[model samples]
Target chain A: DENNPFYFRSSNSFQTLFENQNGRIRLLQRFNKRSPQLENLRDYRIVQFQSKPNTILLPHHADADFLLFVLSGRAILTLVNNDDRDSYNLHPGDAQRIPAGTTYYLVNPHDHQNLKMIWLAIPVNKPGRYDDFFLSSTQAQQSYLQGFSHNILETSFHSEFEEINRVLFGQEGVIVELDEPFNLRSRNPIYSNNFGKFFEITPEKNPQLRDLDIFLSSVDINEGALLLPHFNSKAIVILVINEGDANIELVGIKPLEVQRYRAELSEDDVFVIPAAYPFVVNATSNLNFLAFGINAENNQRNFLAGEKDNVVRQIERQVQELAFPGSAQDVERLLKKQRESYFVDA
Target chain B: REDENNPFYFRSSNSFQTLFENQNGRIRLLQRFNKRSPQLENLRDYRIVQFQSKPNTILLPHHADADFLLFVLSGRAILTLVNNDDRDSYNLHPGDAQRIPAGTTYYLVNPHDHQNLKMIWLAIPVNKPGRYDDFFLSSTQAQQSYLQGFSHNILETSFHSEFEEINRVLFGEEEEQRQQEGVIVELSKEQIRQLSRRAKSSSRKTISSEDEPFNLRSRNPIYSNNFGKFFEITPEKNPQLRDLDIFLSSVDINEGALLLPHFNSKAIVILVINEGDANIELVGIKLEVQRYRAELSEDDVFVIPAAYPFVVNATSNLNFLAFGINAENNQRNFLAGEKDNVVRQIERQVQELAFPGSAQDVERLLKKQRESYFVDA
Candidate 1:
């Protein structure tokens, strides 16, 4: 019954799906994977994608729309079309959407460093969470097209069944080394400053993000800087730190007092911030993290600062006086002193 | 969730109280089907009594602080009731039921010569929930006088008689001189004639067969077939049922009949099987902590937990009475019938959600139950 989501998961827990000299796909299982009630909520999953030297992610499509953010290196993404295709080059700080059922592939053209990226994939088919429909089949997996009977397969291919199998059956597997060898960038988020930069891949920027009610955000803050306290209007956030370190402070609603939960996060560590739960993040050594948000289509940040449009700034004078009794004037000055909404310097 | 043998389960072996017994017959009382089953504490509002009288027997005149619903199980009987200036008489046979309100003076007789009379009495106490006492105005060698407060002079003035004669008649000529029959006594032909006779000059009205009783046998069964017959009398069928906040149901199933799984909406059913033994299967989510396998026979009591599914498998011709509480709103929600089932009521999406894995799962289990209330086992 103690199923109230804990806000942290370390890198070691990720389930390595496919790992080799070329690349790997690791999963940090869905939020509700352990409990009954949790499973009933937060229908979101996070995955890690890392590739070495030169590699190719085989052409495939999944049932969930993807919101991938690059951590380092350069990448190429191609969207396979009807005898035509669109390709984009991606780098660090870039995020892109791959709509569900779209046949797409990725390639890491980098030679010196590993191509590290993270993506949040949400279910399009409400019942089944996620499934990959691979087109290129090997000994590891068979093509979905091959499941069709010989007559139907032959007619679709417009050739002999023997030639059809030869073309359909490829042993390069899922992640392969390319002989050579992705990019849409989201936005330099509205809540950005010199102390740090916040980037967002919301439905407003890429409308396809609204299909599964998802949004992606990255927080890259400087050392000792504070991400001002704020809570989301409707979105529940699952935040995972890819690199650097952060100390997250969250206020829980219970009893008559504010129940504070503090967590120190490391590289690849994850946490969840439920809707309407006020939270602030502090950087120990320049924190960098990504949040996959559910219920994000119409969500807006409600900050606790006294700056423009901040919660404390909008309150009546006497109401604020009574709420923070005996410090009406002093509280008024403190609220006005911040001069920033979502982020503030030390 | 309940234990293996739940405290709610009652058996006649240990719970029955033999209130009155003699050479003529016996009266057994089962009260307080409560406390042990905390949820059934309200059951104290009603009481049950079994009256078994041999041929030519008479249960002397008496009244109690409880309203009486009398159901005849076997043989013949005549009940005489007096309320205020009105007098009502009823001839009862198997399945005939009548309600005699509290404060009425009444007596029952097994007027036949060859058979025994068996009756079930549902009593709702007029004052306290599970407590009541039978009061007899006149005293006999076997019973104390309820009119003991009357002085010699008062009795003489009340009956307009001499003190000697009043005492002899009221207290029944002291001991040895009096006929020593107990409260239940065999009747002679002369005495029966004297009791049956009513003079036209008396101006007292006698309502008998002209008035109808709630006869379970004659009334159409709410659901019936070759396997079983279910008869229910709600407030709609008898207004007295509404006053008591209870209903009467009679279930008669042929040998080897399997009463399908079903549940009552609100009513807790107190079952008293009349004849033969039947295997009772109770299956439900305890809220299981467990389930049940109970078989009861003649003169035993069983409490059917409400809002639960249970089955009745008849090894013999099973005839039982169900006294259902919450008369006004309780309904039997049957899982399946010859025509349809509650499963069919679910349009589509929920069918898959409720049954799991497949929507066709509901369709297959639903189609299997072509039988209604009583499916052939």
Candidate 2:
């Protein structure tokens, strides 16, 4: 087919390209003919990143807006918003508008045969390369977590800080099973104690929290459970109904209840829970379900850039500050933006 | 003081009208509603008659000026193109065009109602108005002696000498003597007034029987009352008209070019029949060579759609000729392009200051008119 040059048809439109710079799926690009990877255009390019089921595209970045148009397939896109605290999911036909420098991630349940994502990007700076931003490297988060130095962590938010690092960098980090998340044990107290007025453990108790909306778990086809039912944030989770059935409902305001929509093609209509309101989607059929965020990026960006002031930036900056930070004027330039963009407190 | 007294005096403006008129002023156009030349010209006082009849109604069995282009906006009309006897029928669809040559006694029928019918007509005069005044020799009380061998019972025709001249031009020398001349005679104004006077003085009841070719007169009444005796309607007399030779075809959109190479012919007119969002802006400069970037404006009475091939020169200073309903047959639609031919004669005189000889009148006329004239490039 590739050689035959036949036009293709898909379940979705190809007019709009999706961007992926936000933490959901950082953009990875190479200049045309310059990189050993793939082709590139100096002005603009159409790109896509599909993950096999149950796979993760580690955090990355691009020198462009990763405008992503989901053509077909489905997956859970996790990203820390403005607060750098909670994570959220993005469904198909769902626009995940990511600002430059925002980090995001994606995890596909290894069940679907193929997952495809189409992207169109106006290059932030063409004839240049794209950069990836990682939460933590292979070794450990402690090795990179800056701002609250090693000396400060030893005295101040030690255990909490260490847990934050481990959750961001450790093996089997935050992809929790229902049993593990609900288990009340010393190793996972973040999920165990429901010590609040509401029956839930807020993502605040844990650091690797990409999203705070309750995760959906099905015990049987007709029965399911919400992992965390109580959360209040600016980000709202909209349930995208049978993705194909109600695709047009994506543009609706004041999210509609999916149960009321029983069309055979009611798949695309997403149910958006009020911003920061912890909600979950439990499929009545023996089917998998996920909560979709409507205003997640705006909420996330506000949360992260406000709460994690200088913390995330300090890590990358520290390497430069300790090594050749004095030699590069870009360090000063970037530091200036960091002051205005990231969380700041006196 | 001299400029006021001198008839040849004219004024010239150094500055252009307005460079930003497109963005600021009203759309101005250089209009040519009528044309004339040494060989052929539009008949003067040929008023543009807007009909009040039914849609696609037949106009008349009257003779043409030199040639007539009937442009219809929203109605359906059919025209019957014929000589004295032979005739062919062509249905006028929306955006369709028809051409009636000089002396062609044709009939136009409005098959539809007037609720949607609309059209513009151009009465091209190859000579003068009095020269092309149409008259139906086949009138009541007229002798049918002229109908000796002709097929038509009542023949409509223009200047009697023009009819004779046209037959002479069409038939070969050997066949000319064998063919019968048209029996119809187009009387001049003086002749008509003389007849009116004779009728009033002599108190004669009728001229001749209605069955004769020279006894038939105008059928439908026209907007213009002819000498208070000859009454004719603007449309719906003889409806079904046959095509002459003009055709139209689509070309590229705006900002493009189409080659219309005129091979053998020179003097010709074409109707730009169009519809939809296509307002072609044909542009070029006034040239000495035979050329013109004439835009198709009126729905009816267009120049010639496509009979003679002529290059379409365009403008890139801005998007011009955009949305033009281009087609393969975009040329002359009428058999006798009298209007275009007359215009070509004028254009040639302006350039060469002389009309080409009779041997190459048509060819030279085209070269001078089309090649000499131009639009804003």
Candidate 3:
């Protein structure tokens, strides 16, 4: 069938890994691994990780690029390369990226609140699957340096074989507990008012993101507020609804006909909008959503309605004659109606 | 110095921070060098950059948001500083070091006919760390003017011109005026003198040795020997380093030799390997004593936390440059030296208690080296 079926059950699709007393990682089954309808979305996967307060997520590296957003609690994330090291304190609503093959560890430092996080993990080395290499020498996760000869280990650490070998074999699980004053960089909202607020980290804001070719946006809107109708130049935006409910409408082209997908977005819900598809979201209640954009390096918003930053307003008047039956002046008048660019009252 | 906040180290490479590049040359900046490392975040106020251009190339005019100390690593340079109405130019050779204060528009040229220009530039972001940016006043064919961010309506009042005239003048009306030479370009022999403000001012005879560039190579090295040689540029040798409270050292050691374990009293070291491979070990004191080790090759960077013990083993013939930051009153407290070693500083009674042995036993172990700083292992 030319039409790929979209209906599927997600209840049993999650495979939980690293289930521990402190925290665990639950990865939703990658698209191409199951559900014949999702072959086109084979590149996408989701991971939900949660850790108890004052715990550690041991050092590990993955063959996947992960764009993570902390949902709640405080986390101290550390990354280590061969000779380089960096660590960042992540707060709720803060977005962080871990490029593939970067060895990293995490610590949840808050006393009372649990650390909740979710991420989009794109497998870089393999199609529809990825592997995580934990530095632990547990029963399930083997020691990464176990293959080296004891002589190599002895010479490397300048120790007797007994001294280094004893510590190498007797390790435990990935999540352990212990833990620092933390400083967090606050992001300025792109647009803020009583009705709604929007914050984004583009390459313009953090050139580090330019290397990942991804962009992140944090948004919260009051009841009856609308995120204006717009299309992205290049990006399939993955929107994760963190709190409250809203109605999301996406208009797209199905063959030669216009098609629309509308849904009531609830808490913990995930939505993906196709590139170049015009979409609008209206909050029925106070709602917060996190958006991550792929193909973001070249991404630009083409707003159909706005006082400024309107792509439709930039279209030639002669094209308006063919695009719309109304007079060109009428097209210009309609485009100028919306006094706001992104956020507006519904 | 007790230490601002001890325990720091982070590293990167030229490929990680290349801001501009072409076949002729490249400009790599090392800022936000430890964006991922929190402990080194405060040091972000400091920046290191490398500039390498081909022969006869002229780097375009630009002004930085930070104060800079430019050291010529190789070749000759004709540097121009345009401070408001004042014009200053200096002829810089391999060892010449100059300070370009913030807000002064400057340009550099590779005046040699056959030699390439290579320089190491250090800067301290005035307002905030890791936010150093350069403002380019002139636009090239490849890049637009920063002022072009404004619309024609805004440009009309600022530039005092009609839309068409302003656009043509700012963007250039002829192809020759907007030639695609890029940010770093080669100038003809005739244009070299034509572009020099010094050549024009030479007739007035105002420039002299008093205004000559500070030649770092002419000074005696901090130390030199068979095992290794150490060259240092300090506040005493070059006053510009004092403004940033920094010092620079170049080290050259033969294969199988070692730089003894030492702790800095005040300065945190930023080092880069320029020639051979090195096995470096850094010790940290936090909740517990931890050791971080790495084997680094050429162009690899290193950061040594102030007061933390560190040593370097030259796996091959090695050459490296180290920049001592916050070095107003810094000392290299060696762990093993005839005189510099703190082991020798310990009283006989203290050494007996510290080692739980006769001072002779410990003294024999330490004094067996017979030399200090550089050890031929």
Candidate 4:
């Protein structure tokens, strides 16, 4: 039965959907019945898109909610809704949510660096499959507007019927190569400091994207920096590596799981931190890794370390003594000694 | 210049809307940037929750996927944080702030006879427009626990206790637990005073609320009407409330009045009934279409998923409160008789095609019972 606790699985391994020597796109899916109890009962599909530099995913809308977490490299995102047009230059760890029914396109602007992104989608319309409607396509079978009459297309475009038809059906491959001059970079940081930076996208930032359940963020830690011990309050995090390498340690909340699990992750690695599990990330000195996370819930982090405002500093001494049984001061020192929240060299 | 586009500032109707309430306590929330300033778009993922509970009331053990910055505003509270093979309890006073990590089992108790417990909290979710999703673990068969997903034998080995002992600790041995009186419970005055004294002496740290630079209470609502009152603050209003979205409303409907059908564009609403009785109707989409109807009285807490259409009808002189996750930029689409509903916009031909009725007859049936958004049930 679907209600049986042992019936479901936690992670769905990637299944390749499309690929070439130059690029690839893969998908992992979980329906309402398959996910763990901690996650909300819904259909969640994760798509990983990677392409050579200057590649573009043609304009399309999936009719679903998409929260994109930039895994690696750089890209330019173009969103077209009605008469308004907006472009965002994305870097490793940058995130944006595309509302259902909105038409958009992705482009890799870098010359040598490839663009990699992991986007999670929740189908608001159907189950099992995502409806991908291509607005601009060369193949008549894939083009959404190819079925429209030439007269109606011409009238809508206010052009010749031939021009309308050709333009509608002449767009090349779904992921096509583009030339240079796609630079539209702007230094827009949601939150930044010496250690790393954070970026978030939401309906408040883009009024057209109003699905509140979706949130994406990108983060980069400096070399030799350590993310303080912390646990998410409400979000089950899906982490994707963008660049460099890091060592991650997490304590699982499952009963009888006393031992801490460790992972030495490098580029292209993906991991999941179950909600409320205490985890720590340490970046190597050679290359500081860029990490992007898709949170099941868009809540904040609760750091256990650091001096002021940390759980350790605020907790009373008597309570600490009871919790630890002995060496209350030791517990206090472990928590209070760390003076930073993120990117601390401990 | 910024105020020109902020639609959320000082809206009387929204201010007086209750998020959660029960006879034992109530909760208030504020998500100022929600439908307000454009700069606060992504910040809608955060919300502030203010909770108040009567003396000696225990807010039962529950786990949520939300990180909370908990600050005591007034009165006294004993908070218990539980993890696998670890448990910590704290006696909190005004101004003391504690961080509750996401997915942790925690509970609160107001152990004072005269002093009602009040707490201010900042809840940050991992995504935009998040809701507070909690799974309670403190009652008998009636209460549901998300922990059921894990194997029961694993829990026994982890806790180093028998299944019966674990069940007694989780579900309780008292009739109150079996009766399903809900999470919030009231104890005798003697128990309250004893716990209060124990808290005062056990913890030497007396953190004063005055020390904190930000005054979260200033966002309290000033308006009152047939409902109750509400107050809200966003990062735009108070910098300290940054990255937290919240809204707090207290509702009081006259006997037989209905709240009307509406759907939250981007929030999962948690309703806690404070006083009187109410009938709730909800439309949910799970694997298949699901519709839920329930009658709730004081101390009952109900959760409605995001984008689900729902309505509350007053069974008695209803007074309730409600809070939402990711309420910032939350929009309500009403399906009631009033408002721009689908029934009003359907073309006569479409109606005839679906219902096999004359155009005039279909139009007459829909329009003849013209009523306001809220009507007597």
Residue lDDT tens for model 2, A1-346: 1111111112231222222322122232322332221231333333545555555554423333444444455656544332232334445544344443334456565364545554444433223333232322332111122222332222222234444343322322211110012211212221221111111122343321223222221111122322222232454442323232211111112257432211222332223334433332233333222233322332432222212233333546557666653734566465455222221212
> What interface Cα RMSD is found for model 4?
16.7
Off by over 4 Å in 1: A1-346, B1-4, B151-162, B193-212, B283-285
Deviation in angstroms for B63 in model 4? 36
Write candidate 2's Cα lDDT for B1-377 as tens digits.
Answer: 12212111111121112111211111111122233211112213232322223432334355645655454445554556666566566555443434556667764555553243444444445676523445442322222223322532222143244445544443323463443233222223443233222111001121121111110122221111111111211111212121222212222223222222221111123223223112221111111111222233222222211112233333321111111011212212111122222222222212121111322432332332121112211
Candidate 3, residue B138: how far the Cα is off, in Å: 1.4
TM-score of each: 0.50, 0.20, 0.49, 0.41
Clashing residue pairs in all predictions, respectively, total 9, 142, 3, 49
Worst 10 residues of 1 chain B by lDDT: B199-208
Predicted candidate 3 versus true structure: per-residue lDDT over B75-159, tens digit per residue: 8888998888788887777656677888779888887768899888877777776667777766776566667778989999988
DockQ, each predicted model? 0.01, 0.00, 0.01, 0.02
lDDT of 1 by residue, A228-325 (tens): 88898888888888788888888877648887777888887878787888999898887888887777887888878837558776788888888986
Calculate the i-RMS of every candidate, to one decimal place.
22.2, 40.7, 15.3, 16.7
Each prediction's RMSD over C-alphas, in Å, is: 19.6, 34.1, 16.0, 19.8
What's the C-alpha lDDT at position B204 in model 4? Answer: 24
Best by TM-score: 1
Worst 10 residues of 4 chain A by lDDT: A178-187
